[PDB]
């Protein structure tokens, strides 16, 4: 028997699951602006325009669409960035004060949703009282009993940052993420991967594609499309405790609008601290809305419904109307220009197997689906238009305690950034690269002593 | 003479004193107490279940317990860690309003008082009731027995954040990389001079310190007999710390069931104060296992004589002063009770010690940011044990050997923490060095 | 050619201009001086000279990112020190003011009554405090009542008086991988190569100058006063004069007594001037007239040399705002103003009368003042003049013998340059190739 020795050159394809940290890689454009979220990409590292991607060949690797860390860390990073953004902004405890509100005025040349509200409020000098005057939405206020239906701040009970800061808030842009040296990103690729178990078309990745951590409630916007057919995924689609996400293979046209308006009156309350007032509507007063053809909705929903019927055993289960929820859940929201739209999705949901969804706008929101503190979106001068970005749908499910299995209502949910972002992020996995140049074989070291 | 070269290759571990930083580690789990910042508040690492130790056959080492400065670093960190946990949480400055009260349904320690506060909407002022302790208020003339907050005109007015209990967690240290712990591992070592069973220690022991005064509770015990140590008891300028070889049970209860009421401090704030009492209103006390205590007194008395020449009668009661030096105390679940310890030592050589609660305290016995300790409903039990005490001679004694009176003392928490560090040093290791050896010179050209 | 093979030898220097972060360093040992605030790195017990015998290096007095870094640090330190301290707005509320009566001059000192709403919710108590001539805003529709100047859109107060500052000679220096080089080149023109360049392990300590016109208590020039500018023909630039010999200043207190405060809350107090002992009009600065005049004679001569003629360099009045008219100074942390146009009058022992202003505009971009707490006891100040900053502009010439140079000013950055003008921080870098005829003794 030949006698042995140990060692090979390292770089042998041996790896372990990584701890999770995300190395921010910028688009090399972020440095040219004056707004938040993009500023976090300014304070980031621009990467290589042509990243290395290498197929592992005869290898499978385990990917899990509903598991582990990567999105959770993004969740926390975004919250921390959000808080850093708002920490410098004013809280205005006195903003809670009840105002006398009447309907919004216009020229004489829908209901009273927007009102002209006013109050006598103590200003930066403690012995001076100024007249407050601003426009407010019913959705942001609470009427007072036995007081001429006057109104108080709706979020007054909680911690409120009464400023998003008009020179700060902005929509997030895509960020590429890199593994730290010693780590690598693997991606499944694999057209139509089921979401669990071994992936057969896996490659090594020198940083992810840019992933945009943008906000919408329930409906996925500004992401990526399925390669051929809609992709319907759940950890267990027959487990009613789980909910199913659907990726579109075709984008859906979106045309959302919000009418032209002004901003005005920085009203000082404190020593260099003020409320920034909603200005007048310019021209006619109308609600926000979205215009989408039913052709696109039906073509995708039909494919989805047929696939669900097949996934569940050729059942007669269909896409159907929502059960409701909190107003922020019933309506499907999005952020354009910093404005928050809440659209009435029942236009699409009140169906079984030029559509215009009225949309509400609201100034006081929590970030995402987080709880505790609240903040508001300052008024935006000009008009807002949002378009052509539906890339995925809404998480859907049902329950049921009926004896019959003939019917089922797949109703919407989601808006949780971990689940929303995970639906695309999961393609990637991060592993630790161990340079284990180790292996026994035959022969001896050329030793003199 | 042969040609020499003086050198030692890296790996002969010369010891230098360590000057800074400890590695915090614990028997970590996804505990609600980490979530709630109960003691350790953040980066304390899950520890090594099997720390190593190396006994060095030829090593003995000079040790001085009062030089265990790593204790100062730990005390400063617990202050900073809790200071961070308490910000911007529960600011109670706006609540200094007057209170009007005479009684509650012993003396009127706790009274049911009325007051108004504004906040939580600037359009309104609201009157309410809550219970207050005499220990935390100052009387005001001519208004139905009015009171102001005792902290009203001083420092910072705050509260412990209500989700946070303060149960000591036995977090230990393993020192940072490049450092090790050197432990004495022997018996009857006096805290000074060399100790002899010296070993390399990876990690030592978790500690569970509490806010206390005269009393050291839930610490470690002595191996055979009560152990009395002081840097130098020659002077009355030094303090004597006594470790027991047996613990003595501590048994206090609320002893009644209270409720909690809200304080509407402001938008988004934590809102809690002391509420109503369910059942009879009863006086707190601890039921102390006096028989065991008395055996410890006999041993303490003996050690206070053995170390003191031919002196005979030793030890007596305290000289008085503020509760922080006079009464023993325990922050039971964050409830800062002070108990009248007199029955434990009203002499020279079952116990039930009445207790009172101070709700606004400086938990570090300094800083000044005294915080209110709100209750949680219902009655509680404070199950703990005595592991040691603080004593010192007054030096105001007469000139005979017949008596030497030591009285209950007190000190910084870090002074009691040194009792753990008593057995070990943190060492910095620098393995590269020199030594002459016959050595061949390399000649290139 | 020969086998001129590539090798890489380094261990001999090369360097680049540094863009790094420098640290506070001093004879570090409670800090009640903001310039250190709470902590500072111990100093270098053995600075070395170390001369680059055959090397010159290109320096530029007006291009130094480290002076800019010092600014970022002074601002940070001002804020860090008072950031956790008390900010007060009840003080915005007006006061009833009257002239102060002293023991037996305009209404320069006033006794004002303020309505105090602090301590307890149902009480408001009027009380007296003293204020100086550099008062706040008078009320247009009332009789000698005043509102706070520093209110409006700001809150300004000595949030925590225990800590303040007096300039301390704190130095600073480079992190690992960096070094500081200095000019030992006498009478350097401020631009281009320095003949004699040597090392700086760390810099000389610097005592910040927070005011205009004069540079006090700094370093001196050797032999002669030195006048320098980025551009001496560009009137937009300020010319700085370093003195070779200093001029003595000794300032005297208006009184010797106390201060009062308003209880705002449990750890919150506001200070105003208390009882007065002495004739308050007496505050003054005693400056040697002869030395100032001789100092100017030397300055005038150097200026004449710089124009090439027997010029007149006239001290026409400048500023238009006391903060930029007077070299005010923070003696004891409180700002004193005197008469800079008395010391240097319309020419080319002097005793200046002095006044106190507690609300003084900071160099910070926010445009806010710092509030100086009143000082109990008495004010005694001494320093020597070590430099002068001058300005000339407007086109008011028409003669080769006529110029108008009068006290000017610039930033704290420009005042700090007095020391930084002598050195540059550079990055230590490895070198490239040391090629030669050799070949490696390869087995392969």
């Amino acid at each position: 028997a030949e006698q042995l020795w140990v060692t090979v050159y390292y770089g042998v394809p041996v790896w372990k699951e990584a701890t999770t940290t995300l190395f921010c890689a910028s688009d090399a454009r972020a440095y040219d602006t004056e707004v938040h979220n993009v500023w976090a990409t300014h304070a980031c590292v621009p990467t290589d325009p042509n990243p290395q991607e290498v197929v592992l060949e005869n290898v499978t690797e385990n990917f899990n669409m509903w598991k582990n860390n990567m999105v959770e860390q993004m969740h926390e990073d975004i919250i921390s960035l959000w808080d850093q953004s708002l920490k410098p902004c004013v809280k205005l405890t006195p903003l809670c004060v009840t105002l006398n509100c009447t309907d919004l005025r216009n020229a004489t040349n829908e209901g009273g949703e927007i009102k002209n509200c006013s109050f006598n409020i103590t200003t930066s000098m403690r012995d001076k009282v100024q007249k407050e005057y601003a426009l407010f939405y019913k959705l942001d206020v609470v009427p007072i009993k036995n007081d001429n239906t006057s109104y108080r701040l709706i979020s007054c009970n909680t911690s409120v940052i009464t400023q998003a800061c008009p020179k700060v808030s902005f929509e997030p842009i895509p960020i590429h993420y890199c593994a730290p040296a010693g780590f690598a990103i693997l991606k499944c690729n694999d057209k139509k991967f089921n979401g669990t178990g071994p992936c057969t078309n896996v490659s090594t990745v020198q940083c992810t594609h840019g992933i945009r951590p943008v906000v919408s409630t329930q409906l996925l916007l500004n992401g990526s499309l399925a390669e051929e057919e809609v992709v319907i995924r759940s950890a267990n689609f027959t487990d009613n405790a789980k909910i199913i996400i659907v990726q579109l293979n075709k984008s859906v046209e979106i045309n959302c609008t919000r009418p032209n308006n002004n901003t005005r009156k920085s009203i000082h309350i404190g020593p260099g601290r003020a409320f920034y007032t909603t200005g007048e509507i310019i021209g006619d007063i109308r609600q926000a809305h979205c215009n989408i053809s039913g052709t696109k909705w039906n073509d995708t929903l039909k494919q989805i419904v047929v696939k669900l019927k097949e996934q569940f055993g050729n059942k007669t289960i269909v896409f159907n109307h929502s059960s409701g929820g909190d107003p922020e859940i019933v309506m499907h929201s999005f952020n354009c220009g910093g404005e928050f739209f809440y659209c009435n999705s029942t236009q699409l949901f009140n169906s079984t197997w030029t559509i215009v969804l009225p949309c509400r706008i609201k100034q006081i929101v929590n970030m995402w689906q987080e709880v505790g503190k609240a903040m508001y979106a300052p008024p935006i001068k000009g008009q807002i238009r949002c378009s052509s970005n539906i890339t995925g749908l809404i998480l859907i499910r049902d329950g049921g305690k009926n004896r019959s299995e003939n019917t089922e209502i797949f109703r919407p949910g989601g808006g949780d950034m971990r689940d929303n972002w995970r639906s695309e992020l999961y393609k990637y996995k991060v592993v630790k690269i161990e340079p284990l140049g180790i292996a026994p074989t035959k022969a001896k070291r050329r030793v003199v002593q | 003479a042969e040609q020499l070269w003086v050198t030692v290759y890296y790996g002969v571990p010369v010891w230098k004193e360590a000057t800074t930083t400890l590695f915090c580690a614990s028997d970590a789990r996804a505990y609600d107490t980490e979530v709630h910042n109960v003691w350790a508040t953040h980066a304390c690492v899950p520890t090594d279940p099997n720390p190593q130790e190396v006994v060095l056959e030829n090593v003995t080492e000079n040790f001085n317990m009062w030089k265990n400065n790593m204790v100062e670093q730990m005390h400063e960190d617990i202050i900073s860690l809790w200071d961070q946990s308490l910000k911007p949480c529960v600011k109670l400055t706006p609540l200094c309003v007057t209170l009007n009260c005479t009684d509650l349904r012993e003396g009127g320690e706790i009274k049911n008082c009325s007051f108004n506060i504004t906040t939580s909407m600037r359009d309104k002022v609201q009157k309410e009731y809550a219970l207050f302790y005499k220990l935390d208020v100052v009387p005001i003339k001519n208004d139905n027995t009015s009171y102001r907050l005792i902290s009203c005109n001083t420092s910072v007015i705050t509260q412990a954040c209500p989700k946070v209990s303060f149960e000591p967690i036995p977090i230990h240290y393993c020192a940072p990389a490049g450092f090790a712990i050197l432990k004495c591992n022997d018996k009857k070592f006096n805290g000074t001079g060399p100790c002899t069973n010296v070993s390399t220690v990876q990690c030592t022991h978790g500690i569970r310190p509490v806010v206390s005064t005269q009393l050291l509770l839930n610490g470690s015990l002595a191996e055979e007999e009560v152990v009395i140590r002081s840097a130098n008891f020659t002077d009355n300028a030094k303090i004597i710390i006594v470790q027991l070889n047996k613990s003595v049970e501590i048994n206090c209860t609320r002893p009644n069931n209270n409720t909690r009421k809200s304080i509407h401090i402001g938008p988004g704030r934590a809102f809690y104060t002391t509420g109503e009492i369910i059942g009879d209103i009863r006086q707190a006390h601890c039921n102390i296992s006096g028989t065991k205590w008395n055996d410890t007194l006999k041993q303490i008395v003996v050690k206070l004589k053995e170390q003191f020449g031919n002196k005979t009668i030793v030890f007596n009661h305290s000289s008085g002063g503020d509760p922080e030096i006079v009464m023993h105390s325990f922050n039971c679940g964050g409830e800062f009770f002070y108990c009248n310890s007199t029955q434990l030592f009203n002499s020279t050589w079952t116990i039930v010690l009445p207790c009172r609660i101070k709700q606004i305290v400086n938990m570090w016995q300094e800083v000044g940011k005294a915080m209110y300790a709100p209750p949680i409903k219902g009655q509680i039990r404070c199950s703990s044990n005595i592991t040691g005490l603080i004593l010192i001679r007054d030096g105001g004694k007469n000139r005979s050997e017949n008596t030497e009176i030591f009285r209950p003392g007190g000190g910084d928490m870090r002074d009691n923490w040194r009792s753990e560090l008593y057995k070990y040093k943190v060492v910095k290791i620098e393995p590269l060095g020199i030594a002459p050896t016959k050595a061949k010179r390399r000649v290139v050209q | 050619a020969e086998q001129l093979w590539v090798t890489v030898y380094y261990g001999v220097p090369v360097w680049k201009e540094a863009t790094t972060t420098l640290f506070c360093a001093s004879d570090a040992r409670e800090v009640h001086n903001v310039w250190a605030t709470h902590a500072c790195v111990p100093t270098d017990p053995n600075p070395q000279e170390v001369v680059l015998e055959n090397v010159t290096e290109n320096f530029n007095m007006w291009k130094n990112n480290m002076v800019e870094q010092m600014h970022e640090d002074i601002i940070s330190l001002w804020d860090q020190s008072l950031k956790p301290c008390v900010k007060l707005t009840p003080l915005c509320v007006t006061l009833n003011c009257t002239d102060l009566r002293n023991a037996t001059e305009g209404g320069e000192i006033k006794n004002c009554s303020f309505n105090i709403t602090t301590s307890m919710r149902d009480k408001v108590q009027k009380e007296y405090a003293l204020f100086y001539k550099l008062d706040v805003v008078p009320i247009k529709n009332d009789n000698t009542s005043y509102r706070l100047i520093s209110c409006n859109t700001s809150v300004i107060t000595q949030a925590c008086p225990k800590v303040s500052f007096e300039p301390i000679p704190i130095h600073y220096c480079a992190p690992a991988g960096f070094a500081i080089l200095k000019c030992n080149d006498k009478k350097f023109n401020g631009t281009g190569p320095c003949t004699n360049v040597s090392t700086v392990q760390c810099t000389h300590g610097i005592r910040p100058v927070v005011s205009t016109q004069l540079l006090l208590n700094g370093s001196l020039a050797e032999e002669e006063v030195v006048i320098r500018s980025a551009n001496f023909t560009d009137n937009a630039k300020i010319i700085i004069v370093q003195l070779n010999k200093s001029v003595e200043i000794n300032c005297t207190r208006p009184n010797n007594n106390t201060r009062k405060s308003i209880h705002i809350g449990p750890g919150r107090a506001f200070y105003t001037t208390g009882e007065i002992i002495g004739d308050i009009r007496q505050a003054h600065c005693n400056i040697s007239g002869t030395k100032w005049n001789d100092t100017l004679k030397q300055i005038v001569v150097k200026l004449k040399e710089q124009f090439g003629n027997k010029t007149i360099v006239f001290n026409h009045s400048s500023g238009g705002d006391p903060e930029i008219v007077m070299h005010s100074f923070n003696c004891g942390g409180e700002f004193f103003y005197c008469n800079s146009t008395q010391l240097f009058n319309s020419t080319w022992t002097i005793v200046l009368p002095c006044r106190i202003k507690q609300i003084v505009n900071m160099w910070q971009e926010v445009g806010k003042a710092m509030y100086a707490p009143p000082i109990k006891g008495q004010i005694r100040c001494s320093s020597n003049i070590t430099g002068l900053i001058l300005i000339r502009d407007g086109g008011k010439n028409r003669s080769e013998n006529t110029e108008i140079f009068r006290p000017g000013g610039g930033d704290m950055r420009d005042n700090w340059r007095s020391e930084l003008y002598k050195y540059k921080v550079v990055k230590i870098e490895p070198l490239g190739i040391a090629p030669t005829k050799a070949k490696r003794r390869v087995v392969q």
Partner: antibody
Amino acid sequence: QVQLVQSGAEVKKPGSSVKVSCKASGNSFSNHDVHWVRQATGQGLEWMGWMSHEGDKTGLAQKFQGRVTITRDSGASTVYMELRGLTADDTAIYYCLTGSKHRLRDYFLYNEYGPNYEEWGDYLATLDVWGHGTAVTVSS
Amino acid sequence: VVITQSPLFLPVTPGEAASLSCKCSHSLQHSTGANYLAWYLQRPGQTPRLLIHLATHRASGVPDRFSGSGSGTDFTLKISRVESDDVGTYYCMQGLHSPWTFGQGTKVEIKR
């Protein structure tokens, strides 16, 4: 129109007393202030003192300070003016206020936690036409 | 503050205007704005009647014979077309922040 009720005319001996009961029909007084005067024959009016329906009260004319005490029946919405030490010079027809006062304030001051240091209680809002009023005289 | 009403007696030709005045030797205004103006009339056989003239406010029933204005230390009331119906004593009301009392009383009569 509210019927304004007052005690009927009376004559008292010097140094004596009378009580004037001013009931507002319909109990309108519960929403109105009361302020009371004297009009001697051939003379103008003077107030003796004031009370709100809210219970805020003070004398006004510094000559009745110990001569007139004003109270009320909050159930019957009736105000009682008790006059003491009546003399010949007190012969007059007495009248109660109609109309109202508002709690006017014109000094605003709040601290950071919002305590109210406002100065208020000025300004009559409306004027007082009363009904007949009642004569009180003194004789012997 | 005090109040007087010069000339305190105005016999008139019926149909002639009256000019009544108030002097208080105190500067009066609502502290919050305009001066407080009020007046009342007590005709023989009557309880007071109101003639408020509070810039824009008059008691219901006041005819256009009556109008007035003022501020500071004084004010006036003009009565156009004075008739026998207007005979009585005219009282000028004080301001409302000292606090307030009543007028002096000016008699207006038709000349015999």
